[PDB]
Paper text:
The bacterial periplasmic methionine‐binding protein MetQ is involved in the import of methionine by the cognate MetNI methionine ATP binding cassette (ABC) transporter. MetQ, the substrate‐binding protein (SBP) for MetNI,5, 6 is proposed to play a dual role in transport by either binding l‐methionine for delivery to the translocation pathway of MetNI, or by facilitating d‐methionine uptake through the ligand‐free form when complexed to the transporter. Structural studies of SBPs in their ligand‐bound and ligand‐free forms have revealed a hinge‐bending or “Venus‐flytrap” mechanism where two domains of SBPs adopt their open conformation with an accessible binding site in the absence of substrate; substrate binding stabilizes the closed conformation, where the two domains come together and sequester the substrate. In this study, we report the structures of the Neisseria meningitides MetQ in substrate‐free form and in complexes with l‐methionine and with d‐methionine, along with the associated binding constants determined by isothermal titration calorimetry.
With the exception of MetQ found in the MetNIQ complex, the structure of substrate‐free MetQ has not been reported. Since MetQ has a high affinity for l‐methionine, preparation of the apo‐MetQ requires cycles of unfolding and refolding to remove the bound ligand. As an alternative approach, mutation of Asn229 to Ala (N229A) in the binding pocket of the E. coli MetQ was found to substantially decrease the affinity toward methionine, thereby greatly facilitating preparation of the substrate‐free form of MetQ. Structures of the substrate‐free (N238A) and substrate‐bound N. meningitides MetQ are related by a “Venus‐fly trap” hinge‐type movement of the two domains accompanying methionine binding and dissociation. l‐ and d‐methionine bind to the same site on MetQ, and this study emphasizes the important role of asparagine 238 in ligand binding and affinity. As this asparagine residue interacts with both the α‐amino and α‐carboxyl groups of l‐methionine, mutation to alanine would be expected to significantly impair ligand binding. Three distinct conformational states have been characterized to date for MetQ: one liganded and two ligand‐free forms. A thermodynamic analysis demonstrates that ligand‐free MetQ associates with the ATP‐bound form of MetNI ∼40 times more tightly than does liganded MetQ, consistent with the necessity of dissociating methionine from MetQ for transport to occur.
Residue numbers in the entry: 44 to 284
């Protein structure tokens, strides 16, 4: 038996709908433990109550295992609900004007991700040599297109598209509000916040983990993810697949 821990939602659905049967074909059984918060999964992993968890991105994992002194590590990436720039009052990227408004989530990590995206688009230029994970308005070296960024609560972003020219919406709120991820005009190119699986470090070279990694990178899983999770950001190793 391989004991998976996930949050309730997409990451558990991957286990239940595709990964479980794939690993059954390889001699294993899969036991899914669902968690409703983000603190317990790594602790349960570290105490040996889980063999692997799939819920978090690497910035979160790094901070968590540092602060709790856990001997755990990321293993592989999984398809992840993406941060996207969606149409607002304007309907395409080249309609952007000097002074165009962009709504964005106001929590510091998501806001930093928005700034990095706008820098990739060429609408702003961030200072050089900064930590992209903590980018803030102070780090804008040149506002190329004089964009006005309207900071709102993440949950409010789906309703802002009448108020601003473009809206940056988190994948989770895009999904829960009925938006299609494929509607985004521009999806976050960075992989810095794609979700990873995690294990105890002592287990990182184990045979069962090689088989789990294979299952999460198999052709069957890829086709499943392309149908079930259209628009999600794929693991880098899939080559945009």
């Amino acid at each position: 038996e391989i004991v998976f821990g996930t949050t309730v939602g997409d990451f558990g659905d991957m286990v239940k709908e595709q990964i479980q049967a794939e690993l059954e074909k390889k001699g294993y059984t899969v036991k899914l433990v669902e968690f409703t918060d983000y603190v317990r999964p790594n602790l349960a992993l570290a105490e040996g109550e889980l063999d692997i968890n799939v819920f978090q991105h690497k910035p979160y994992l790094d901070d968590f295992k540092k602060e709790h002194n856990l001997d755990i590590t990321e293993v592989f990436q999984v398809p992840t609900a993406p941060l996207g720039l969606y149409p607002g009052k304007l309907k395409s990227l080249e309609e952007v004007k000097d002074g165009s408004t962009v709504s964005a989530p106001n929590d510091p990590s998501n806001f930093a991700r928005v700034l990095v995206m706008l820098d990739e688009l060429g609408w702003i230029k961030l200072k050089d040599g900064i930590n992209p994970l903590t980018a803030s308005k102070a780090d804008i070296a040149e506002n190329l297109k004089n964009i006005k960024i309207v900071e709102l609560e993440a949950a409010q972003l789906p309703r802002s598209r009448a108020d601003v020219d473009f809206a940056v919406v988190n994948g989770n709120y895009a999904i829960s509000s009925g938006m299609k991820l494929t509607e985004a005009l521009f999806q976050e190119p960075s992989f810095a916040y794609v979700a990873w699986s995690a294990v105890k470090t002592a287990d990182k070279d184990s045979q069962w983990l090689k088989d789990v990694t294979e299952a999460y990178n198999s052709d069957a899983f890829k086709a499943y993810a392309h149908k079930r999770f259209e628009g999600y950001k794929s693991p880098a190793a899939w080559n945009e697949g």
